[PDB]
Ligand binder design. Structure first.
Ligand code: 35B
Ligand code: CL
Ligand code: CL
Ligand code: CL
Ligand code: CL
Ligand code: CL
Ligand code: CL
Ligand code: MG
Length: 297
């Protein structure tokens, strides 16, 4: 049981060993396509690639490659697309993916600039009157509105397929205070944000998989998805004790390498799930508590 295991690991201060164990046992699959010479400039990091078997393929004949993985959690019955922060030359591909995969939500866990460096291209319009057109993929993207909170922002976007003139609303959830290689300020601020994403309907099985990204699309993205999936599993069974966090993380790592980057992010995952379990099992007060503790106002 997660709560007992957590306290046991904390008492012996062996989170490093636990996390390293996961790295040791993690799946290893080929990333041949990602490593093709013609795709070098489509990758933000040399050492972070999507496995061939689970990679998202763009629906084009030229080059179908994007650094993005489909994490399909069979048991939980929810899927995520984890991807790197788009590059100046892959913003068109990013939005093509969103369109083709029928995603309704995009979760961004990083800032464009972190620690003096550019972790992600400016891939969405910052102003209503200045829409973006991606000529290579024939898509238009307009900022419709934004709801700015203290540590996160929610944007409404309109994505248009210029070829068919079909239009779709995309919800953009931007967590701006989650440090790279770090953890959220508190389980409360994290859960508050996760529930914002959930309550938008972006995770519904009626839509395509939500798109989740940070810079590399494995550390913070992995942490976010592990917590959500664990809460879902627990929800479906209404039994918190039935969820094996490490086993779920290992399952997720079958679909993309390196999910969750530090031992403390793993530890934080436990915190988030243990606290979130209160809502799952019928506590009607914790949701407001989190909102207050998060100081989103
Ligand atoms: C020490 N690094 C490491 O062991 N690796 C790795 C390799 C290349 C980039 C990254 C980055 S750079 C970055 C950022 O945002 O600057 C980020 O994100 C952190 C977060 O999101 O917390 C991550 Br991961 C990590 C691994 C070796 C290969 C397999 C997995 C990665
Ligand atoms: Cl496959
Ligand atoms: Cl504006
Ligand atoms: Cl303006
Ligand atoms: Cl303005
Ligand atoms: Cl204005
Ligand atoms: Cl304006
Ligand atoms: Mg304005």
């Amino acid at each position: 049981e997660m709560e007992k295991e957590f306290e046991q690991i904390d008492k012996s201060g062996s989170w490093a060993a636990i996390y390293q164990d996961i790295r040791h046992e993690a799946s290893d699959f080929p990333c041949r396509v990602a490593k093709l010479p013609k795709n070098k400039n489509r990758n933000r990091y040399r050492d972070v690639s999507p496995f061939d078997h689970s990679r998202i393929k763009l629906h084009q004949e030229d080059n179908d490659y994007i650094n993005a993985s489909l994490i399909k959690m069979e048991e939980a019955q929810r899927s995520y697309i984890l991807t790197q922060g788009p590059l100046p030359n892959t913003c068109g591909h990013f939005w093509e993916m969103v369109w083709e995969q029928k995603s309704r939500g995009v979760v961004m866990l990083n800032r464009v600039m972190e620690k003096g460096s550019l972790k992600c291209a400016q891939y969405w319009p910052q102003k209503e009157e200045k829409e973006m057109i991606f000529e290579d993929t024939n898509l238009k993207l307009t900022l419709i509105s934004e709801d700015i909170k203290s540590y996160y922002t929610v944007r409404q976007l309109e994505l248009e397929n210029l070829t068919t003139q079909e239009t779709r609303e995309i919800l953009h959830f931007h967590y701006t205070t989650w440090p790279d290689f770090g953890v959220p300020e508190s389980p409360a601020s994290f859960l508050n944000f996760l529930f914002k994403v959930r309550e938008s309907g972006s995770l519904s099985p009626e839509h395509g998989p939500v798109v989740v990204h940070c810079s590399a699309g494995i550390g913070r993205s992995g942490t976010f998805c592990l917590a959500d999936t664990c809460l879902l599993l627990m929800d479906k069974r209404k039994d918190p004790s039935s969820v094996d966090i490490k086993k779920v993380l290992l399952e997720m790592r079958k679909f993309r390498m390196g999910l969750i980057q530090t031992a403390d992010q793993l530890r934080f995952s436990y915190l988030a799930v243990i606290e979130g379990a209160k809502f799952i099992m019928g506590d009607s007060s914790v949701q407001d508590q989190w909102k207050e503790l998060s100081h989103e106002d």
